[PDB]
Symmetry: none
Subunit: 201 residues, 2 copies
């Protein structure tokens, strides 16, 4: 929507994850996940707008370590993912994910999710794995006060989005009701699985 494709922010060295994603997540986790409502609470609009700016200027690590409002870092990550010219799960798989997540039989649904994920382009799959492992630690932090369902409600519009750049009002709405379930199944896929995308050799 705003700047560019996910593939444009990753190197070529697996795991292919944008460094903006890596630095944001690391920062958040390095602080212990002690804050309440991570990813739910918005960060000061002015704090978040600067970062987006003085980001291309000075290096990342020094940046984020200085941010007082952690939530501003959460909005930074979320905005970045939301502004990819195409959703993290890609336009061309957007329907496969919703449909797979809609299967009522859990075991059968999980199976269809593994298939949809197997179809993700590598960079998207690595970035997804990394992001998911993170959100599982968040939902398991007794402090954050955010569970899988809450987080799925938030990242629904973020990584799932729609199948086209600009949906009609009716499709947009029906879509938004089906996105949270997609993120829930993904977060239900084991940490033992997602971790495998962090392999290096």
């Amino acid at each position: 929507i705003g700047e560019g494709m996910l593939a444009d922010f990753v190197s070529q060295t697996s795991p292919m994850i944008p460094s903006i994603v890596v630095h944001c997540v690391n920062e958040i986790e390095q602080r212990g996940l002690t804050e309440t409502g991570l990813y739910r609470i918005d960060g000061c609009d002015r704090t978040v707008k600067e970062l987006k700016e003085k980001f291309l200027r000075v290096k990342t690590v020094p940046l984020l370590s200085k941010v007082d409002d952690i939530h501003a870092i959460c909005s930074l990550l979320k905005d970045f993912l939301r502004n990819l010219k195409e959703p993290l799960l890609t336009f061309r798989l957007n329907r496969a994910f919703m449909e797979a997540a809609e299967i009522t039989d859990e075991d059968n649904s999980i199976a269809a999710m593994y298939q949809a994920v197997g179809e993700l382009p590598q960079a998207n799959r690595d970035t997804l794995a990394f992001l998911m492992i993170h959100l599982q630690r968040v939902a398991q932090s007794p402090h954050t006060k955010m569970d899988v369902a809450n987080l799925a409600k938030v990242f629904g519009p973020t990584i799932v989005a729609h199948a086209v750049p600009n949906p009609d009002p009716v499709t947009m709405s029906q879509d938004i009701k089906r996105q949270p379930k997609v993120v829930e199944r993904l977060l239900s896929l084991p940490l033992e699985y997602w971790s495998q995308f962090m392999m290096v050799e």
Copy 2:
């Protein structure tokens, strides 16, 4: 044929994989990946017969480093698997796997394969997984001159087999024509999917 259930060769400790499969796979990955025709070339039954005894009967770990001809270890592994009381993929799911592999729609078929792998008894799933990871490397070794299809030809009878102990010569023959596709699909499920099962827990 010449052994008991798989469950007998594993402990409650995960991943549940028989010592013999782990030792064979490890010796074959040491000096077997350079050898052409792995799993396709057979080993002097003289040797295989010996080891299979010094390995299981003696309940001791025979330093497979002593065995010059690496093809003997490949045949010993297939032998162990083939001769289990029931195929690695079980009787119960024998038809389910074949059918799944036969579904004409790609996406649906793959999904069916995940569904089926998920129905496997745990011991069967870890062993299968450990084995699938090993065979993917073999197919990835330029020297072995074995691709997914080749290994599927060989392991079709080794791990899929039949859905009954004593099938008639026709069912037997129809089955043999459907096994290759099953092992082919399995070998196509992603390294990251199989590897989640190897995590110590």
